[PDB]
């Protein structure tokens, strides 16, 4: 990837490669997304889940959410990628987290960005003010939170009000990754990815992690592409056998248009190439990312 990276950079060809990926990517129907009744369930008219990998809500009324299951078979990790919840679909989002048995929610965007409300405020910002989502009968409380300078970790309690079963959900909120943008550095992104990893939420005893940005494609695609490249590499301890563009194409079978610009593609190569130092047995790089990232 690293010889590949410098051949791309050297000849200024990131947009054409990105363009090429774009022409190779799958396209499957998104007919349920586009039903008239689901119009207000999609944030963006042109970003829909394919029918074959969409998450169905376990409810008879209307089972649709804008969300897909990215099942990475070789890597043996799955993720749910979803749009930032809308004001009428926060109760569906939480219904999805409960039914799917997810332990973690990775949020890569802010509620407000570039002057616009890119996502609903779907979680409580304070402990005394729980949310009840009456359409899906679910209660959520802020148990606490750890605010760093570029991310915050929250612990949430999700109650299914129908059984009174309770689960803890960890929320990993990256607050300084710009829409259509890249993280400040490979260090700080890697520091963030490894916080999520260490917490256990990626672990196969749990449902798939839920990753969202505002559309569930650009920042989320970038997050997942890095994670999975690094997992692949880990399982074989063989960096040279991971084909990043080929992993992004496999992920694009399950949701359209994963990774939104050519600099996000380029950052993913940066992230995986740096992350490999750690996968290949230099644990010291991890606490270096931590220093560089200025987390406190
Ligand atoms: O949130 C991201 O990282 C991302 O993919 N966002 C996307 S992808 C996308 C859009 C947006 C957006 O937020 O405006 C606007 C419609 S075109 C494709």
From Swiss-Prot:
Belongs to the protein-tyrosine phosphatase family. Non-receptor class 1 subfamily. The lineage of its organism: Eukaryota, Metazoa, Chordata, Craniata, Vertebrata. Expressed in keratinocytes (at protein level). The modification Phosphotyrosine is found at residues 18, 64. Keywords: Acetylation, Endoplasmic reticulum, Hydrolase, Membrane, Oxidation, Phosphoprotein, Protein phosphatase, S-nitrosylation. One of its GO terms (molecular function) is insulin receptor binding. The modification Cysteine sulfenic acid (-SOH) is found at residue 213. Oxidized on Cys-213; the Cys-SOH formed in response to redox signaling reacts with the alpha-amido of the following residue to form a sulfenamide cross-link, triggering a conformational change that inhibits substrate binding and activity. The active site can be restored by reduction. Ser-48 is the major site of phosphorylation as compared to Ser-240 and Ser-241. Activated by phosphorylation at Ser-48. It is a peripheral membrane protein. GO terms for biological process: actin cytoskeleton organization; cellular response to angiotensin; cellular response to fibroblast growth factor stimulus; cellular response to hypoxia; cellular response to nerve growth factor stimulus; cellular response to nitric oxide; cellular response to platelet-derived growth factor stimulus; cellular response to unfolded protein. It catalyses: O-phospho-L-tyrosyl-[protein] + H2O = L-tyrosyl-[protein] + phosphate. Interacts with EPHA3 (phosphorylated); dephosphorylates EPHA3 and may regulate its trafficking and function. Interacts with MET. Interacts with NCK1. It is found in: Endoplasmic reticulum membrane. Its EC number is 3.1.3.48. The chain holds residues 3 to 298 of 435 of the full protein. Its main location: endoplasmic reticulum. It comes from the Eukaryota. This is Tyrosine-protein phosphatase non-receptor type 1. It comes from Homo sapiens (Human). The gene is PTPN1. Substrate binds at residues 179, 213-219, 260. Transmembrane segments: none annotated. GO terms for cellular component: cytoplasm; cytoplasmic side of endoplasmic reticulum membrane; cytosol; early endosome; endoplasmic reticulum; endosome lumen; glutamatergic synapse; mitochondrial crista.
């Amino acid at each position: 990837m690293e010889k590949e990276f410098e051949q791309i950079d050297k000849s200024g060809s990131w947009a054409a490669i990105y363009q090429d990926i774009r022409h190779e990517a799958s396209d499957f129907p998104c007919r349920v997304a586009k039903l008239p009744k689901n119009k207000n369930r999609n944030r963006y008219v042109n970003v829909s889940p394919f029918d074959h990998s969409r998450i169905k809500l376990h409810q008879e009324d209307n089972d649709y959410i804008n969300a897909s299951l990215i099942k990475m078979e070789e890597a043996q990790r799955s993720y749910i990628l979803t749009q930032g919840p809308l004001p009428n679909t926060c109760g569906h989002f939480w219904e999805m987290v409960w039914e799917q048995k997810s332990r973690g929610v990775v949020m890569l965007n802010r509620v407000m960005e570039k002057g616009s409300l890119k996502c609903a405020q779907y979680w409580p910002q304070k402990e005394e003010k729980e949310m009840i989502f009456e359409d899906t009968n679910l209660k959520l409380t802020l148990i606490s939170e750890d605010i760093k300078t570029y991310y915050t970790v929250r612990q949430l309690e999700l109650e299914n009000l129908t059984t009174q079963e309770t689960r803890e959900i960890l929320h990993f909120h990256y607050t300084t990754w710009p829409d259509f943008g890249v993280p400040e550095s490979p260090a700080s992104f890697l520091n963030f990815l490894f916080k999520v990893r260490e917490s256990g939420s990626l672990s196969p005893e749990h449902g798939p992690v839920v990753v969202h940005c505002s559309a569930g494609i650009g920042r989320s695609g970038t997050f997942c592409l890095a994670d999975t490249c690094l997992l692949l590499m880990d399982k074989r301890k063989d960096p040279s056998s991971v084909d990043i563009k080929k992993v992004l194409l496999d992920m694009r079978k399950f949701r359209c248009q994963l990774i939104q610009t050519a600099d996000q593609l380029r950052f993913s190569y940066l992230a995986v190439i740096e992350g490999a130092k750690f996968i290949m047995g230099d644990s010291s790089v991890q606490d270096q990312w931590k220093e560089l990232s200025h987390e406190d």
